[PDB]
Amino acid sequence: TLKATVVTKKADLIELDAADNGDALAKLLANLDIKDQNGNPMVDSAATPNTNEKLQALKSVLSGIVSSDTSVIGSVSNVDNLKDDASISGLAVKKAGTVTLTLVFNEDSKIAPIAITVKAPAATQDGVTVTGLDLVPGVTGVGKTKFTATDKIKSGHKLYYAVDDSAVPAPAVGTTRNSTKFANEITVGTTEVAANAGQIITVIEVDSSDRVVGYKTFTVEAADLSVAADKTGFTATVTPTGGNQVTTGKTLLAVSDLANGHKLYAAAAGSSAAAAPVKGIAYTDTTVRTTYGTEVTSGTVEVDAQDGQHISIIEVDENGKVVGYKDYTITGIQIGTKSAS
Ligand SMILES: [Ca+2]
Ligand SMILES: [Os+3]
Ligand SMILES: [Os+3]
Numbered sequence: 001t002l003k004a005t006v007v008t009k010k011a012d013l014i015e016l017d018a019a020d021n022g023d024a025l026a027k028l029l030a031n032l033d034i035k036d037q038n039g040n041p042m043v044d045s046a047a048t049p050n051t052n053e054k055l056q057a058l059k060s061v062l063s064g065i066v067s068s069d070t071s072v073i074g075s076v077s078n079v080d081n082l083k084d085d086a087s088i089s090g091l092a093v094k095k096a097g098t099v100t101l102t103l104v105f106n107e108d109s110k111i112a113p114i115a116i117t118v119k120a121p122a123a124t125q126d127g128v129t130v131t132g133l134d135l136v137p138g139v140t141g142v143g144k145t146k147f148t149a150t151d152k153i154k155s156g157h158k159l160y161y162a163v164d165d166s167a168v169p170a171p172a173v174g175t176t177r178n179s180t181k182f183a184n185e186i187t188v189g190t191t192e193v194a195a196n197a198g199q200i201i202t203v204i205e206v207d208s209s210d211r212v213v214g215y216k217t218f219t220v221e222a223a224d225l226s227v228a229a230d231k232t233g234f235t236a237t238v239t240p241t242g243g244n245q246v247t248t249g250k251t252l253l254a255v256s257d258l259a260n261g262h263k264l265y266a267a268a269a270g271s272s273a274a275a276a277p278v279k280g281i282a283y284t285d286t287t288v289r290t291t292y293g294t295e296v297t298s299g300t301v302e303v304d305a306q307d308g309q310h311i312s313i314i315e316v317d318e319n320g321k322v323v324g325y326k327d328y329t330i331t332g333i334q335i336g337t338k339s340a341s
Helices: 025-030 053-061 286-291
Strands: 006-009 013-015 032-035 062-066 097-105 114-120 134-137 144-148 158-164 192-194 200-206 212-219 237-241 243-247 250-256 263-266 302-304 310-316 322-329 336-338
Touching (some): 013 025, 025 032, 025 053, 053 062, 237 322, 250 336
Parallel strands (some): 013 114, 243 336
Antiparallel strands (some): 006 032, 134 144, 144 192, 158 200, 200 212, 237 250, 263 310, 310 322
16 A cells, blocks of 8 residues: 655665674665655554565565675575565575675666675674683593683583684674584583694584574694603503512512502503503593503502513503503513412
8 A cells, every 4th residue: 555665775884793693684674764655664563563564665666686796695586585474584694795785676666776785794703702712632532632611601602613624714693503514512621623733623603593603713733632641641660570479470560659649550461552541531431441450559469471462551640530651561580480379
């Protein structure tokens, strides 16, 4: 009954945010003024909740919307794709960037084309709610890095990472998470990444509705990556001991001065050394506790030994964490000879 007669833009530019939910139509509408035959404003009245007057008014006079870059915001050729079912859509944001959306009207309306520049910003560091997000060496394996933070995330928000040789481009704020690109959810102080030094860990923060709000990149340095347990963390001196004092085919692992609350655990004698656990792993870890199943802390423990075989020993601290590692090749001299059992 009322026909849209006058359409004018307010500003030449509109910039999107997270609240815009990665779709420009709501902000494009807010940037347009529509007047009818009477010169009266054409406004979405809340008394008619499931029919938007303003959008419908625009759609009745609009022949299309051209984008300057179809990869940033897709061009609208069929006008009925603009809708207000549940929410206002869709000048859908595909990628972060800046476009000139040019609105073309029908011949009847006689309204000349209106160009509105739309900026869809990339997600940034100040959009990240977790303060002090940083990389530390891993404790689950060797060559691993771990996420740490000082303060918690905002309630409802989540973190996701990507690991690559190059930084993954910052997505537009408000766009729904790229499942493919950012597939690895971060539990802070728990989750670990296998990475090489020099690689980039690209982290995005999403909201409750899986939409990109934050973005931070870390360059993985050798300092941020985990290494095997060293002789550096090994304080005790262990002397394999044989002769007539020790049982035949067994070596006495005589222990000298470990630090007050330290413990020592030996792996069973085998043809080559046992795998050195990552510095910081709990002894209670299944592979660690099964490989290094014999506690040799007392200095009085004697274990099975053959000539060529290796005995690897780990030094665990007061807390229950692996600190030191050293591998011992056994000799016939340090294998026992005393009467059996
Ligand atoms: Ca309405
Ligand atoms: Os939120
Ligand atoms: Os200690």
